[PDB]
Amino acid sequence: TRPNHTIYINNLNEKIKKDELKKSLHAIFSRFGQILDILVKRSLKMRGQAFVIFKEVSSATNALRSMQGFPFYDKPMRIQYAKTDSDIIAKMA
RNA sequence: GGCAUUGUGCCUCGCAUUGCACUCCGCGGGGCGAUAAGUCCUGAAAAGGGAUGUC
Ligand SMILES: C[S@@+](CC[C@H](N)C(=O)[O-])C[C@H]1O[C@@H](n2cnc3c(N)ncnc32)[C@H](O)[C@@H]1O
C-alpha cells in the first residue's frame, strides 16, 4: 500500500478502553514523530482499530516498519498505511 | 431532585466482530452528567457544557 501520513492499526485488543487506548497509542508512536491526531472508536466497524495521523510521512513509514507485529496488550499490531488521506491532512495541502 | 420526551457520547456483561475512519450507533442485558467522552449544545474564539416540558 502507498505511503501516507496516517497508519491504520488493526488487530488491537478490543477490551482496552477508548481513553487508555488512544493515549497508549499516542505515547508509543510519539517516539517515531510528531502526531497530529489519533482516531479511535469501539463501535462495531471501528473496534480493534486505530488511525494515528503523523505530521511527516517519513515518521509513519519509520513507525510502520519498526512496530509491525509488536506485542501490544497481548496482541501483535497489524500496521498498514491508510488507504486514503485523513481529513485533517487532506485540507492542509 | 421526581416524571415525559430526547440530542451527545462512556463503562460493563453475553453473543458476535480482523473491521479503512473522520458522513462515526451490531444485537441483547445492565449502569451513567461524570469534562470522562462526545459526531450533540453555548461562545466570536479561547474555553465551557446536556436539553425541552413538567410536580
Ligand atoms: C434516552 S437514555 C440514553 C439512550 C442512549 N441515547 C442510547 O442510545 O442508548 C437517557 C439517559 O442516558 C444517560 N445518559 C445519556 N447521555 C449521557 C451522558 N452524556 N453522560 C451521562 N449519562 C448519559 C442518562 O442516564 C440519561 O438519564
Residue numbers in the entry: 6 to 98
Reproduce passages from the article.
Recently, a new SAM-riboswitch class, termed SAM-VI, has been identified in species of Bifidobacterium by Breaker and co-workers using computational methods of comparative sequence analysis. One transcript from B. angulatum 59 metK in which the U1A recognition site had been introduced as terminal loop of stem P2 (and the non-conserved G42 had been mutated to U42) yielded diffraction quality crystals when co-crystallized with the U1A protein. The SAM-VI fold is composed of three stems P1, P2, and P3 that are consistent with the originally predicted secondary structure. Stem P2 (in violet) stacks co-axially with stem P1 (in green), mediated by two intercalating base pairs from the junctional region of the riboswitch and the ligand SAM.
We solved the structure with single-wavelength anomalous diffraction (SAD) phasing by collecting the anomalous signal of selenium in selenomethionine (SeMet)-derivatized U1A protein used in co-crystallization. The surface representation of the SAM-VI pocket shows that the adenine base of SAM (shown in sticks) is intercalating and becomes stacked, while the sulfonium moiety and the methionine tail point outward from the adenine intercalation site. The binding pocket itself is composed of one terminal Watson-Crick base pair G9-C32 from stem P2, one non-canonical (trans Watson-Crick) base pair G7•G33 from J1-2 and J2-3, four continuously stacked residues A34, A36, A37, and G38 from J2-3, and importantly, the U8 (from J1-2) that recognizes the SAM-adenine base. The SAM ligand adopts a C3′-endo ribose conformation and the SAM-adenine base is in anti conformation at the glycosidic bond when bound to SAM-VI RNA. The Hoogsteen edge of the SAM-adenine pairs with the Watson-Crick edge of U8. Furthermore, 6-NH2 of A36 and N1 of A37 also form one hydrogen bond each with the Watson-Crick edge of the adenine base of SAM. The non-bridging phosphate-oxygen of G33 forms one hydrogen bond with the 2′-OH of the ribose sugar of SAM. Notably, the methionine tail is structured and folds back, supported by an H-bond interaction between the α-amino group of the SAM methionine and O4 of U8. We further note that the sulfonium moiety of SAM is in the vicinity of the O4 atom of the U6 nucleobase (4.8 Å). The O4 of U6 likely assists in recognition and stabilization of the positive charge of the sulfonium moiety.
